RNA sequence: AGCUUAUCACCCCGGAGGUUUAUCCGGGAUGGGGUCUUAUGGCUGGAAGAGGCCAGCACUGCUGGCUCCGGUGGCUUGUGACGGCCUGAAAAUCCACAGGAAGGAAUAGUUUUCAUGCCAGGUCGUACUGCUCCAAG
RNA sequence: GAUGGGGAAGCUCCGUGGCCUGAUUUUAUGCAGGCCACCAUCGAAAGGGAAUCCGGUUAAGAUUCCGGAACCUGG
RNA sequence: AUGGUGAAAGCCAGCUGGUGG
């Protein structure tokens, strides 16, 4: 054959530049990014930066040619184009003064659905359960986010309803096996089909919203996460035989509209699920019911809230410096004891966590030689030096695990 | 540098129109009604937008459904068809006449203002046929008029006609003066 | 070596610039937004 | 707080909270989740293998160095008193007359046990190299300085034994020049004149041939002369650079010419390039030849030392980089397999070698122990060293106008 | 393919003749000291196992040797370096130079104009005859 | 020689965009900015052009087949 | 007629003697 060019094959065709891919797709960067997020496409590091390009040392992001080529045939592009055409037509109608025509046009529109995207991105339910970690982590945070100009209140309400559905299913299924509390929030873990899915529930305080973060990307991710969560919830309810979607409890919604509402029905096999069995609890006002109520409900206990009006209870939770009544029939407990019980999975004695006492720390449940190294090769010598430098940090951590722990105790 | 051929042609057309001397019959447009009175006229007309295809279909379907299970007054709307408007004018039936200043065939509407003046029917010229079309659910109409205004708005229409008289017919009664377009 | 294969995420280059400069631009836009309201009182 | 973003193991400061209800809401939750979402699609995903091999397994299973004893361990005698730094050292074939030479022109000889001096004799004139005649019972010592080379026979031996070398010098009766009156009065035998300043010198195993190197002489950078005949020859006349050193093969009629980047083995009889070496280092400083010729060893200015296997390939079989400064002297022991290495950092090392040649196998080398004591002065450390003929004793010189002798 | 091999061209001292067949060079020469572009010269491997020159016997091949060492005295070719007369093509393709944005560290910091190793390299013309090719004394 | 065009009723004649950057582009998921200058194609088996040499093979083939040994483009 | 086809400069020695062609 004729003289082939210096670099026009191999990495030069397997990867396509971001700008080149966008130009070939004839799609705006916003729409391309949305499609990428929906498909989960990501940039890849070429084996040789200067070989993928034509000797260019300038920075670049290399995508997979096959992935982009396959993405070009997805219906989502057609739906996006239809949405753009509908938007232009609605703008024309609004500018023409025919509000009724605009209302009729808008009322007859239908949005796209990502159901087929899920069946190809996560062909099997275990994969969806594995990847639901990020979806839960985002939805739980968005549930407590107050409504703003960047996100309509309907989206926040839908996210909160999805989170409530998930929490109710978990409590009824009692699949929770490990819990933890952190500054960033309260971590919850459930053995959903043995996948030990973990999610972080942030504190219910008013979530500060820094305007720097671009909500457009966040909303795009949240849409896919909400669809995935809805499908997973439907699948789980069908597998368990419970009705779906469960009906909200209007009577309970008036009081606190907490986890108690949204009752579910059909149509104790583990130490975690058997703890607190048949127990009745009373939560003081100052303790977060939203956090403790879920744990007790999953454990199979009963909780009486102070707001029940806004005894027979064998356990009481209060964080006040001084308890007022101290009825002998109620066992006063700090939430740290409840957390420790779930972490260990056994009924640790309650006498160690009386109110007002010290709070114990809470931990998560999860030349002889130099002589022979003179002749080592450059690669081996560098590897050994880097390994020693890395192990220096491990040794420092091991030393510090006891140094301060012993020094502070003496004072 | 270079520019699109059509862009250059249209740009040169504006210069030619500005510099070329036009007869008194031409340039009678662009001496349009003031912004305020034109806005008031459009506001009044918006209350009488003719029924659109969707609304008419909905009304007919509702009537059919009512009949299936088992005396409205005369409809009121603005008349905008050029042939229909011209047939209404010269019959002393139209009360207000609106004429667009940007009709592509100028000769198509040169006689309409003069015909209205001869017939004595009040008339006015407004900028843009697109504005007239927007209020009648059409791309363009080039003309607009009212024939049967509701009693509630009869006084408003009379006052608008009286104001338009002074605003346009009296201010531009000398539009027949020295040929326009005499700009260096 | 007995190494365990795994997926790795390379650090996003120029993230610090994309954060700081964008924050500064947003601050400037917010500051300039009130200017239009202040100056629209002379209509 | 002063560190830049994303270069931080933890994005929050842990704090002690007395109660759960007193825990404040997190002030960075939204930012962290937004960054995670961004990385989920903008972070370049790569497939990598995480190394889990312990560093201990990388240690080679070399023979224990102590089993290779004896070898030098610590100093036992020190020579000093020179006004200038001792640039070179020389030892007689019997390992008794340790000669010393310094850039100030002072020449001294010291005992190997008590260290007492036995004889003494004398910016652009310095002594560059001194080497005892490999042949025994001659007492001929060569001295290189400036553009001339001097042959000196000190009175350490006597008159008849020294008359033996005087007869060789007279047998001859760049060109040779008669000694000056001062040279004659200072027990200097004869002098030679070279085209340019000489910087290196080496004797032949037979005690008759020797070579000299004249830097800045592009064509005459290297010359060969004979004591008996006062000959003047050259193995090669041209090269792609200046020549740095030259040495004779212990038992073959070829001279090892060491250039800056290359070393060339030129046959003095066949006048052909037997082999050309391609050292892994960039520039070479000195070269020595194993007495059996099985291994070629050289030193490089860029802290490198070369172990050139003449049977395996042109490039060195193995290279060492532990030296902290330019390697200045590397020589093979006359009897033992040990070879020493010294550099300007004042560090000396000795390595045992499996010189076994009964089979087509590469020689195994192991380090023995580190040595120090030559404090670096003006960035210069160990200048030259020589091995004892029969025992693991090493003589070293440094820029501090001091020489040290190491013994087991 | 590795050594080896440089007319020309260029570098350091110098301070008032060198040189071609054919007049060319200098107040920076005569001279001394060096570098480089490898045109084709010698070595080896390829490579004597190839081919050729002989002897012997088989009765369808084999066995033994030689294939070496030179010289300069006319035709020829390729190239190099000089010197006479008015500017003698275009494109494809490789390399370098000014450049400093970009990227480079702790269980592999970045790269592989370095070395070795691996794979693939399509279609047509292709026999014969034949304006153009080689020419001993 | 088409091509941007122009005569001829007429077969017909004259005329000689692909690259890079961005957190996804603040009234809220409709795209922003920067680089350079022109006109395809055909037209050389004596021009430029990357690469193979020795021995043998026939009824016609080889620098293609074989025996031996290298060279050039690309990943 | 209609519609097509084909092609001696120079320089060396003492105007005299010389070299290059």
From Swiss-Prot, chain A:
Compositional bias per record (Basic residues), positions renumbered to this chain: 379-388, 402-411
Entry-linked PROSITE patterns: BRCT (PS50172)
Coiled coil found in the keyword field: yes
Any one biological process term the GO annotation gives: rRNA processing
Residue ranges annotated for the BRCT domain, each copy included: 271-355
Broad class of the protein's primary localization: nucleus
InterPro entries associated with the record: BRCT_dom, BRCT_dom_sf, PES
Biased segments, Basic and acidic residues type: 392-401
Keyword entries, A-Z: Coiled coil, Nucleus, Phosphoprotein, Ribosome biogenesis, rRNA processing
CDD domains according to UniProt: BRCT_pescadillo_like
Free-text disruption phenotype from the record: Essential gene. Reduced assembly of 60S ribosomes and accumulation of halfmer polyribosomes.
Claim: Chloroplast is one of the keywords in the record: no
Substitution effect: residue 337 to R: Temperature sensitive mutant
Region (Sufficient for interaction with ERB1): 51-366
Upregulation: Expression is down-regulated prior to the diauxic shift.
Outcome of substituting residue 296 to R: Temperature sensitive mutant
GO cellular component, one term: nucleolus
Localisation: Nucleus, Nucleolus; Nucleus, Nucleoplasm
Molecular function GO labels: large ribosomal subunit rRNA binding; mRNA binding; ribonucleoprotein complex binding; RNA binding; rRNA binding
Stated family: Belongs to the pescadillo family.
Extra remark: Present with 4530 molecules/cell in log phase SD medium.
Assembly description: Component of the NOP7 complex, composed of ERB1, NOP7 and YTM1. The complex is held together by ERB1, which interacts with NOP7 via its N-terminal domain and with YTM1 via a high-affinity interaction between the seven-bladed beta-propeller domains of the 2 proteins. The NOP7 complex associates with the 66S pre-ribosome. Also interacts with NOG1. May also associate with the origin recognition complex (ORC complex).
Cited function: Component of the NOP7 complex, which is required for maturation of the 25S and 5.8S ribosomal RNAs and formation of the 60S ribosome.
UniProt protein name: Pescadillo homolog
From Swiss-Prot, chain B:
Protein keywords: Cytoplasm, Ribonucleoprotein, Ribosomal protein
UniProt keyword Chloroplast, yes or no: no
Compartments where located: Cytoplasm
UniProt keyword annotation of Ribonucleoprotein present: yes
One annotated GO molecular function: structural constituent of ribosome
Principal subcellular localization: cytoplasm
Gene Ontology CC entries for this record: cytosol; cytosolic large ribosomal subunit
Bridged cysteine pairs (disulfide): none
Coiled-coil residues: none
Example GO BP: maturation of LSU-rRNA
Extra remark beyond the main annotation: Present with 238000 molecules/cell in log phase SD medium.
Family affiliation: Belongs to the eukaryotic ribosomal protein eL8 family.
Role according to the record: Component of the ribosome, a large ribonucleoprotein complex responsible for the synthesis of proteins in the cell. The small ribosomal subunit (SSU) binds messenger RNAs (mRNAs) and translates the encoded message by selecting cognate aminoacyl-transfer RNA (tRNA) molecules. The large subunit (LSU) contains the ribosomal catalytic site termed the peptidyl transferase center (PTC), which catalyzes the formation of peptide bonds, thereby polymerizing the amino acids delivered by tRNAs into a polypeptide chain.
Subunit structure: Component of the large ribosomal subunit (LSU). Mature yeast ribosomes consist of a small (40S) and a large (60S) subunit. The 40S small subunit contains 1 molecule of ribosomal RNA (18S rRNA) and 33 different proteins (encoded by 57 genes). The large 60S subunit contains 3 rRNA molecules (25S, 5.8S and 5S rRNA) and 46 different proteins (encoded by 81 genes).
Protein name: Large ribosomal subunit protein eL8A
Designated gene of the protein: RPL8A
Residues of the full protein shown: 50 to 238 of 256
Swiss-Prot record, chain C:
Annotated localization: Nucleus, Nucleolus
Disordered as annotated region, ranges: 1-41
Biased composition (Basic and acidic residues): 15-34
Domain of life: Eukaryota
Family designation: Belongs to the universal ribosomal protein uL30 family.
Note: Present with 7720 molecules/cell in log phase SD medium.
Name of protein: Ribosome biogenesis protein RLP7
Species of origin: Saccharomyces cerevisiae (strain ATCC 204508 / S288c) (Baker's yeast)
Gene for this chain: RLP7
Span of the entire protein shown here: 12 to 54 of 322
Swiss-Prot record, chain D:
Subcellular location: Nucleus, Nucleolus; Nucleus, Nucleoplasm
Main location per the UniProt record: nucleus
Annotated keywords: Isopeptide bond, Nucleus, Phosphoprotein, Repeat, Ribosome biogenesis, rRNA processing, Ubl conjugation, WD repeat
Source superkingdom: Eukaryota
Keyword Plastid (UniProt): no
Sequence positions bearing Phosphoserine: 64
Miscellaneous note of the record: Present with 2680 molecules/cell in log phase SD medium.
Membership in a protein family: Belongs to the WD repeat BOP1/ERB1 family.
Protein name: Ribosome biogenesis protein ERB1
Organism: Saccharomyces cerevisiae (strain ATCC 204508 / S288c) (Baker's yeast)
The organism's taxonomic lineage, starting at the top: Eukaryota, Fungi, Dikarya, Ascomycota, Saccharomycotina
């Amino acid at each position: 054959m004729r003289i082939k060019k210096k670099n026009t094959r191999g990495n030069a065709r397997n990867f396509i530049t971001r700008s080149q891919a966008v130009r070939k797709l004839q799609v705006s960067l916003a729409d391309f990014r949305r499609l990428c997020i929906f498909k989960g496409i990501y940039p890849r590091e070429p084996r040789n930066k200067k070989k993928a390009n034509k000797g260019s040392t300038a920075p670049t992001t290399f995508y997979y040619a096959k992935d982009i080529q396959y993405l070009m045939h997805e219906p989502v592009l057609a739906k996006f184009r239809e949405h753009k055409t509908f938007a232009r037509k609605l703008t024309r109608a609004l500018g023409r003064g025919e509000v009724s025509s605009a209302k009729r046009l808008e009322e007859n529109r239908d949005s796209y659905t990502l159901d087929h995207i899920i069946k190809e991105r996560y062909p099997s339910f275990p994969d969806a359960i594995r990847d639901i970690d990020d979806a839960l982590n985002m939805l739980f945070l968005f549930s407590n986010l107050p409504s703003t100009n960047q996100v309509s209140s309907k989206i926040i309400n839908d996210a909160q309803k999805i989170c409530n559905q998930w929490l109710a299913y978990v409590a009824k299924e009692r699949l929770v096996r490990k819990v933890f509390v952190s500054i960033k929030g309260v971590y919850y873990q459930a053995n959903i089909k043995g996948e030990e899915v973990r999610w972080l529930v942030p504190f219910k305080f008013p979530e500060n919203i820094p305007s720097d973060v671009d909500f457009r990307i966040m909303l795009t991710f949240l849409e896919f996460y909400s669809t995935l969560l809805h499908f997973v919830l439907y699948k789980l309810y069908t597998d368990s035989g419970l009705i779906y979607p469960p009906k909200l409890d209007l009577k309970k919604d008036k009081i606190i509209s907490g986890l108690s509402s949204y009752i579910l029905e059909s149509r104790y096999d583990s130490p975690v699920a058997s703890l607190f069995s048949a127990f009745v609890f009373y939560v003081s006002r100052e303790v977060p019911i939203d956090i403790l109520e879920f744990l007790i409900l999953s454990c199979g206990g009963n909780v009486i809230s102070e707001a029940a009006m806004d005894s027979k209870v064998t356990h009481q939770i209060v964080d006040r410096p001084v308890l007022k009544n101290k009825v002998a029939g109620r066992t006063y407990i700090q939430p740290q004891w409840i957390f420790d019980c779930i972490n260990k999975g056994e009924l640790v004695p309650a006498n160690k966590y009386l109110p007002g006492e010290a709070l114990p720390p809470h931990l998560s449940p999860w030349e002889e030689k130099k002589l022979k190294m003179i002749m080592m090769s450059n690669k081996q010598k560098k590897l050994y030096k880097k390994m020693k430098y890395s192990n220096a940090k491990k040794e420092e951590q091991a030393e510090n695990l006891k140094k301060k722990k012993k020094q502070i105790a003496k004072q | 540098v270079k520019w699109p051929e059509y862009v250059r042609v249209q740009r040169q057309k504006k210069i030619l129109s500005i510099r070329l001397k036009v007869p008194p019959t031409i340039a009678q447009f662009q001496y349009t009604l003031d912004r305020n009175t034109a806005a008031e006229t459009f506001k009044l007309f918006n209350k009488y937008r003719p029924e659109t295809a969707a609304e008419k279909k909905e009304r007919l379907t509702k009537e059919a459904a009512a009949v299936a299970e088992g005396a409205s007054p005369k409809p009121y709307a603005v008349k905008y068809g050029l042939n229909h408007v011209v047939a209404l004018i010269e019959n002393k039936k139209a009360k207000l006449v609106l004429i667009a200043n940007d009709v592509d065939p100028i000769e198509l509407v040169v006689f309409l203002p003069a015909l209205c003046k001869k017939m004595g029917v009040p008339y006015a010229i407004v900028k843009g046929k697109a504005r007239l079309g927007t209020l009648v659910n059409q791309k363009t109409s080039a003309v607009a008029a009212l024939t049967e205004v509701r009693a509630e708005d009869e006084a408003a229409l009379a006052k608008l006609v009286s104001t338009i008289d002074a605003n346009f017919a009296d201010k531009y009664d000398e539009v027949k003066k020295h040929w326009g377009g005499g700009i260096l | 070596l007995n190494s365990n294969p795994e997926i790795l995420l390379r650090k996003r280059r120029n993230a610090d610039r994309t954060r700081i400069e964008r924050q500064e631009l947003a601050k400037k836009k917010r500051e300039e937004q009130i200017k239009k309201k202040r100056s629209n009182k002379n209509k | 707080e002063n560190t830049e973003y994303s270069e931080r193991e933890r994005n929050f400061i842990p704090q002690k909270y007395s109660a759960l209800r007193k825990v404040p809401g997190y002030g960075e939750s939204i930012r962290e989740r937004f960054e995670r979402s961004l990385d989920l699609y903008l972070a370049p995903r790569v497939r990598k293998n995480k190394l889990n091999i312990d560093p201990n397994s990388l240690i080679p299973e070399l023979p224990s160095p102590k089993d290779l004893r004896p070898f030098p361990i610590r100093c036992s005698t020190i020579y000093a008193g020179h006004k200038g730094k001792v640039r070179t050292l020389s030892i007689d074939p019997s390992g008794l007359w340790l000669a010393t030479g310094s850039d100030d022109g002072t020449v001294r000889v010291w005992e190997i046990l008590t260290g007492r001096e036995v004889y003494r004799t004398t910016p652009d004139y310095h002594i560059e190299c001194i080497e005892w005649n490999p042949d025994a019972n001659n007492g001929i010592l060569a001295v290189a300085v400036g553009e001339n080379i001097h042959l000196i026979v000190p009175p350490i031996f006597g008159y008849d034994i020294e008359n033996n070398g005087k007869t060789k010098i007279e047998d001859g009766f760049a060109q040779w020049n008669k000694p000056s009156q001062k040279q004659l009065e200072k027990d200097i035998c004869i002098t030679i004149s070279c085209k340019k300043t000489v910087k290196k010198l080496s004797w032949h195993r037979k005690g008759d041939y020797f070579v000299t190197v004249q830097p800045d002489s592009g064509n005459t950078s290297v010359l060969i002369h004979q004591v008996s005949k006062h000959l003047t020859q050259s193995p090669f006349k041209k090269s792609k650079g200046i020549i740095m050193d030259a040495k004779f093969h212990p038992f073959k009629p070829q001279l090892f010419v060491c250039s800056q980047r290359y070393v060339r083995i030129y046959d003095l009889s066949q006048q052909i390039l037997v082999k050309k070496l391609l050292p892994g280092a960039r520039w070479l400083s000195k070269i020595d030849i194993h007495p059996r010729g099985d291994n070629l060893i050289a030193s490089s200015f860029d802290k490198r030392v070369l172990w050139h296997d003449l049977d395996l390939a042109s490039t060195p079989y193995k290279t060492l980089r532990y030296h902290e400064k330019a390697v200045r002297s590397v020589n093979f022991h006359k009897k033992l397999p040990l070879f020493s290495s010294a550099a300007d950092d004042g560090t000396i090392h000795v390595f045992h070698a499996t010189v076994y040649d009964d089979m087509m196998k590469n020689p195994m080398i192991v380090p023995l122990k580190k040595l120090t004591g030559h404090k670096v002065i003006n960035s210069l450390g160990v200048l030259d060293a020589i091995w004892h003929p029969r025992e693991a004793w090493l003589f070293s010189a440094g820029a501090d106008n001091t020489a040290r002798l190491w013994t087991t």
